[PDB]
Symmetry: C6
Subunit: 323 residues, 6 copies
Amino acid sequence: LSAEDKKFLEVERALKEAALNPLRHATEELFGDFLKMENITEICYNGNKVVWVLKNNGEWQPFDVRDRKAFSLSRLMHFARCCASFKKKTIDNYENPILSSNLANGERVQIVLSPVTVNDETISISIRIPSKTTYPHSFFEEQGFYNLLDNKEQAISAIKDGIAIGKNVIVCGGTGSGKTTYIKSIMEFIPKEERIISIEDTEEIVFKHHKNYTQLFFGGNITSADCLKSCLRMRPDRIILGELRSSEAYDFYNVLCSGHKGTLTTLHAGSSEEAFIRLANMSSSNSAARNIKFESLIEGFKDLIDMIVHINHHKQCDEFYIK
Amino acid sequence: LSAEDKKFLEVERALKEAALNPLRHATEELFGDFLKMENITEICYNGNKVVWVLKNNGEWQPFDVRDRKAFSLSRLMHFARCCASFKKKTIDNYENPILSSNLANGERVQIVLSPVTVNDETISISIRIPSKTTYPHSFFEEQGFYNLLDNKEQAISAIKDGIAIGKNVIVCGGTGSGKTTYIKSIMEFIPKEERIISIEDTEEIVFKHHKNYTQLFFGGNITSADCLKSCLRMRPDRIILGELRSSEAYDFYNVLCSGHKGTLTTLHAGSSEEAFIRLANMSSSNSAARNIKFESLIEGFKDLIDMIVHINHHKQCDEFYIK
Amino acid sequence: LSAEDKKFLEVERALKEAALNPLRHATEELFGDFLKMENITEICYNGNKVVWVLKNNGEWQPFDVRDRKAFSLSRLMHFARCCASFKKKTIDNYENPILSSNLANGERVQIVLSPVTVNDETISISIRIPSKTTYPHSFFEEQGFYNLLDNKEQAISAIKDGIAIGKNVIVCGGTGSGKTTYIKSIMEFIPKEERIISIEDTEEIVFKHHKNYTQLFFGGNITSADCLKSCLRMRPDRIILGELRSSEAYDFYNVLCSGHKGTLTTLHAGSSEEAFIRLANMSSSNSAARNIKFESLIEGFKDLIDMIVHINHHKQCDEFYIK
Amino acid sequence: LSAEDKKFLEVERALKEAALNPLRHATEELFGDFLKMENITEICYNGNKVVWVLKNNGEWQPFDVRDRKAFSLSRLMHFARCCASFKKKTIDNYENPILSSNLANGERVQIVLSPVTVNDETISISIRIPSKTTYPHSFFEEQGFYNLLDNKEQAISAIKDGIAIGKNVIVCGGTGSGKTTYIKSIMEFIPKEERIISIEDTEEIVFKHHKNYTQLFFGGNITSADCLKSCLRMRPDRIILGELRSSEAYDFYNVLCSGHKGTLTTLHAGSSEEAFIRLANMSSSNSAARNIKFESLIEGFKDLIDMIVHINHHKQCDEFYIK
Amino acid sequence: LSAEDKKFLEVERALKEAALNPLRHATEELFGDFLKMENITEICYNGNKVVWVLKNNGEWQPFDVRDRKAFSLSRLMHFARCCASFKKKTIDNYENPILSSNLANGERVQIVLSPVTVNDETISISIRIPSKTTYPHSFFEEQGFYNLLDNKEQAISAIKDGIAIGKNVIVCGGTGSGKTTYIKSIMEFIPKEERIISIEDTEEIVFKHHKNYTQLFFGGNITSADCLKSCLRMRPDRIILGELRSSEAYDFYNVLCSGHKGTLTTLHAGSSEEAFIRLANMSSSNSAARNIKFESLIEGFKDLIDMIVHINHHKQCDEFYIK
Amino acid sequence: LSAEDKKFLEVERALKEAALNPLRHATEELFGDFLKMENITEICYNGNKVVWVLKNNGEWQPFDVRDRKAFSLSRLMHFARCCASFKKKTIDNYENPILSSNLANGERVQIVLSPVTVNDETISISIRIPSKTTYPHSFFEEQGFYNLLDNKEQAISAIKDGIAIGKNVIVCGGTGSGKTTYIKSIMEFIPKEERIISIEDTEEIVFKHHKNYTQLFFGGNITSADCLKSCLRMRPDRIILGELRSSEAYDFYNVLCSGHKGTLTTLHAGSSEEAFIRLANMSSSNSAARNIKFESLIEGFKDLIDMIVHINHHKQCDEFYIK
Ligand SMILES: Nc1ncnc2c1ncn2[C@@H]1O[C@H](COP(=O)(O)OP(=O)(O)OP(O)(O)=S)[C@@H](O)[C@H]1O
Ligand SMILES: Nc1ncnc2c1ncn2[C@@H]1O[C@H](COP(=O)(O)OP(=O)(O)OP(O)(O)=S)[C@@H](O)[C@H]1O
Ligand SMILES: Nc1ncnc2c1ncn2[C@@H]1O[C@H](COP(=O)(O)OP(=O)(O)OP(O)(O)=S)[C@@H](O)[C@H]1O
Ligand SMILES: [Mg+2]
Ligand SMILES: [Mg+2]
Ligand SMILES: [Mg+2]
């Protein structure tokens, strides 16, 4: 089969690998060193000859590249273009000065050029390093994840038992707060017989205890809602929504209204009460919600969401909303 | 007549059977074995050389196909395309990566390709086996369908008598909860003289006790609402709506408002109170509902729906809402 | 004049009669026998070689046509097409599988073909036999039409006197409940000097006691609202709206708001309270109602509608709402 | 000047009078006799060889024309077309079966043809005779116009004094109730120095006591609102709105909100409370009202309208709302 | 500079002065005499050979022009056309029968032709004479402008002091009530150092005590809102809005919400409470107000507007709302 | 790298500097002298040969240019066009009479021409001088910035501590009130380790204590929201929004709802309570807010905004809203 599968992939691979190699060398050439760094969460470039790296410990570390070819207005632009074309987009100094794309391996990239940056020699790049490690839940308890909670044992058991029964759980907090990481470890408590479907933007979730599953990715023409909609047609036992965005927003409510099993998703929210408002908002953006009272959605999400876990900027649970 | 009916069908049959045969062999070739399995509810493929089958008893069973030609990226793609073309759709790795269609006999098929699947060697297929059996109502009582209810006799008699008088009844619950099945058996209690019209997506309902009837199917160009709208022009005594979707949603409310006889339909809802909300939601999606207060619909459905029956994941009634 | 009127009609008649004859023979050929049957209300065909006829007494009678040429897939399709073209529409197995048209004499026809019907040999036809008889009001009293009412004399006199004074009256109930028939007999109590205008879909109303009048028909490009709008420009004393549909819905409210005389109309509603909701709904569908509070319409119709009469499935008044 | 005015009008006159003459002879030819009848309010034809005329005393009088050439399907059609073309419209038996236009002198005409009329030999015409006489107010008092009122003197003086001060007054009631007439007589009490602007559909208002004035007519391209909008740019002391229609509806509210002087208009409403609702409705039809609470308009009109006078079907004031 | 400025203006001037001269002679030719008349406010023509002039004292004076060439259907039309073309518009007897334009000097003109006027010999013209005089505030006190007020000294001082501090003041009343005139005199109390920007339709405001200022005019493609929007970009100390219209309506609210200094504007409103409603209305017409509660605007304007002055038809303050 | 960076910029620089030089000389030629003046805030020209300059101390100073070539209708127009073309816009006396652009260095320019200005010799220019200086916070305390406050120490410490913790703070007041300035000094209290992203319209913010940062500019094709949206993808610790405009308005609410760190922005509002209303308004302009109750936004912003500081026209804090 592989002999035929290869000849069958040949055409697409050639095409893809004819746009992914130029980008691979450029990436390698510029941010290669930094990408090798362990425990980092972001790599930024403020077109000022210095590369700023954000570490898991929340510390920004600057690096000097004054004397490097890979950081020439031209060498930079070539990498920029490599990013646009990869995701089939264009990047220039007129109509498309701002850009959003990805690297060869999947990391999100944010590129900005003049006239949007302060001058014509400033090229702003911002790469987001996904969750590339899986620590067991126990690891989280050890590091004292539920230490700020007064319902410490109640929480540690709620999460374990709850998820095992298929409650709808939301993990929220700020950027890089460790939400994705957290949901990844608590997956240990989902019966290994459950068919799981995940909707991601970047492959981040890993299935260490589940043979039957399937991953879905949105981006470009295909939308987050498209994945979730397809998801509900693929007979899932558990649906792991990388992170509620805005498209899924409303369709997520309906999925909850049909009394759907184990839902687990991360979201940008500063707390439980906030998450609830956060959801109503995003839902109301969808036309289908047009005729539904706003304060009617919040109550709606408040009946459906079983438990919420919020994580502060110090990667620690500081709120464990239940029921 | 058959001699002319044949020559008259000849042209359409040729055309149809020139797109249905390629699909039949592919189907047969790949999921032939699995489709033959008794008491299954879904057949999934996660493009990882293993076929997962979900049994009626809720158990997932993996089957190895590492050494089968029918599971070659090419052999799989040919079957995929056969599905697209059958329902007159296209499936590719650019604009049409996700697909929804059917098999030669009517079973729903969900196909997903790269870039939506994790890689270019993953082809996700999800086949849903319809309700292909009819157990008498008595069979449900024997298996203790109304055993979790405290109003056990009241329930078993309500359903029987109610339906016989033409009350509006909704059967709700999760996917594969046995709703389609349940309504099919309780049809025994509808006077055999009643002209029945059903709106389905896949032939599933069977008329074992009714000579005068007619089945309607939506899909593609023709919408669920279209069928129901035509239905109301075909002089029905009972209308069996396969399952409230969203188009019919509002038009179903109006049909209830005109005080229509015996309505029976399945719906995705986790309970009685949920079904009510579920309906208001779907109704409000229809423009015609634009000027109608949301909390006005729920009350609306709550006056019209005579009785609701919810089935848990263990195929058992756990709620018997009435009046 | 007739000599010239004939030469003047010649062109249109030729055209019309060149599409109405093909349809006449086909009709005659297939459902000719059944159409001759007295006291029937519907003739259905479930493309299964059996013709089902619904009688006034609410009984379904099957007839075998296994051995009849008029019921050959081809012979059927020819009649089908004859129906489309007549009303200037198309009927096929692709974009136009469902059809709604009429017969040579005016009866509504509902035709459905594959892929909407279960298979390619099933052709569903449903003809609605209009009200083709006029029983005097006295006949209704004799058959005990107001017998279920406790305000028996009050009702029999209300209807008589009310209509004589030009109150707005609505006759509602299910399909074939005898509404049109009822309004037709109670017309006896409208001063013979009143100019009456009727808006129908199929000629059904007959003027036995009124010389000055005019009938209006909607269908195709011309809408129900168009007739009513023209109606209000033809100086009517009484307006008989065959049956409130949805277009007239709102324009009917305004007509009531201008304090218009004797309005009489039939409607699909299961009761008085229902009719009121039924109206608000239909009105809110019209854009012009966009800025009007829904609960504001119901109250609106409740101030305007003088009396409502509902008829159960046994062709008997079971509710006589007044004031 | 007349010598040049003639040569200057020559071109337009020729054109107009080349479409108005054909119509004049047809008119003359058919309804010539009837149009000559004194005290009539409508002339209808139900394409059944009989001409029905409605007299001021509310009596319908039938006239036989069985033996007249002017009533030949052709002779009738020629007159019909003459009406269409006059107002630059088309009338046929397909897309333009219904028609609304006018006669050589301005009377509204409603023409209906098959398929909208019952058959192809029925041509329905409905002519409305405008208010072609002016009876002094005193004449109304003599005929006992304010006789049903208990506030008889208060009413007769309110109208006189009120109007003299420029209050906003509405005259409402049914069709032909004598509203147009009533307002025309009460104009006697408007200081002769007032510049008056009227917005009509058909010249009906006459200025017997006012030298400074100007009449405006809407129809076709030009809308009722257009006239009123131009009106407010022509420095009016009094604005006589023939009859609130729907366009002016909202723009009338704003005109009242700017505290405008003497407004006088007729409206189709069955009473004071009704007129108020009637107004809110029509206002809410205008987009500009989109963001304005419905129950906010009624209160709005209720602050602005100074006094309303309703006339029953017997041409008598039966309600004299004030303040 | 003038030598070059002339050669620089040459092109535009030629063009403008090649359309303004034809209009100058026509104007001069027809309404030349009347325009010379002192203390007039409007000049109307009802195409009946008589010219009606409205004097400041509120008296209408007719003038006979039966024997004047300037009033020939042709001589009139030439002037009419001169008006259209000037403001780059068209005026005819078909699609553009109504017209709005201006004269060589800026006065608003309203022209109406058949079929909108009663006949083909009636040409209605209405010229509005702007405020062409500036009376000192003292002049207003002398003529007893604040004489009907009980808070006579409080009012005379409020206006003086208030405006000096930059409160938001609205002057409202009917047409020609003397609002523009009033605001023009009270400008005396604005510190001469304030940079003032005015948004007018016709130059009317005069700056007698302010060197630093700038006038803005809307008309044609440029809208009232455009001026105000530009205004807020020209660093104004005081903004004099000729008169709130409808475009500025909402943008005026926001300007008040940002806590902007000295706003002074005239408006058509019959009183303080009315002005407040008047504003909410106009604001709600703007899309940007779409999601803002109507009763939320009124309160909004009621917090922002510092003081309102209303003037009756006798050019006298009759309401001095404050705080 | 510089050798290649130059050859790489060469093409864009040539182009830009081929449109920026003409503008530089014109600028220099006309407002060169004024631009050199210290402590000014605006430079206006009212096309009347006098240049008005507004000084920091709020004083308007007139300068005579009667005898200068740079102020010739032509010389002025050339500079005007230079402005249009620079920002790729057009400026003429027909469709583009009003203009908004910038100067060679970034200062906003407002140009107005006839017919919008009073005549064809009036060319109105309004130049706004950005914040080109940075006074330490201490400097503000010395000049008694918090002197009008009663919570003087509480305020001076709130700002210092609050900002250090990353509270959301809004600085509001009138134009040129010193907001841009104020926020710039209080930046001293943001841990130097924070990555800061600013969204400006004109480079004004200066980073004196922050190495890791990036500036964003909107204008033309690129919108304020675009920058903020990109901002949220560039991993910011603090987001300095030049000044809430209207696009960001709603997207700012959501950013607050996700519980985002340190937000600091200036806004046009006359006070705390006003700012709150100001925000709800701007938010409701965005479609995404369509389904969100207005009074729901104000409460929303009132939960999220930590502290507001308002500055009167005398550049002094007069309100210090907290919590
Ligand atoms: N308990 C932990 N101990 C150490 N590092 C951790 C911990 N939890 C998460 N991380 C680190 O945090 C990063 C992953 O953060 P995520 O969980 O993806 O952040 P995030 O908050 O989900 O960001 P977005 O905006 O949602 S994509 C990786 O670098 C991890 O190694
Ligand atoms: N009192 C009666 N006795 C006997 N037959 C009746 C009576 N009233 C009505 N019918 C029969 O009922 C049929 C007419 O029913 P309709 O009055 O048109 O029904 P309908 O309810 O108005 O249907 P739609 O859906 O409104 S078109 C005819 O066959 C009649 O002969
Ligand atoms: N106190 C006054 N005494 C004498 N004439 C006055 C006085 N105030 C105003 N006028 C006259 O009124 C006219 C100006 O009226 P405006 O103040 O422009 O009217 P207006 O009400 O503002 O009209 P619009 O509809 O707003 S354009 C001029 O003819 C003035 O001479
Ligand atoms: Mg994450
Ligand atoms: Mg009927
Ligand atoms: Mg004015």
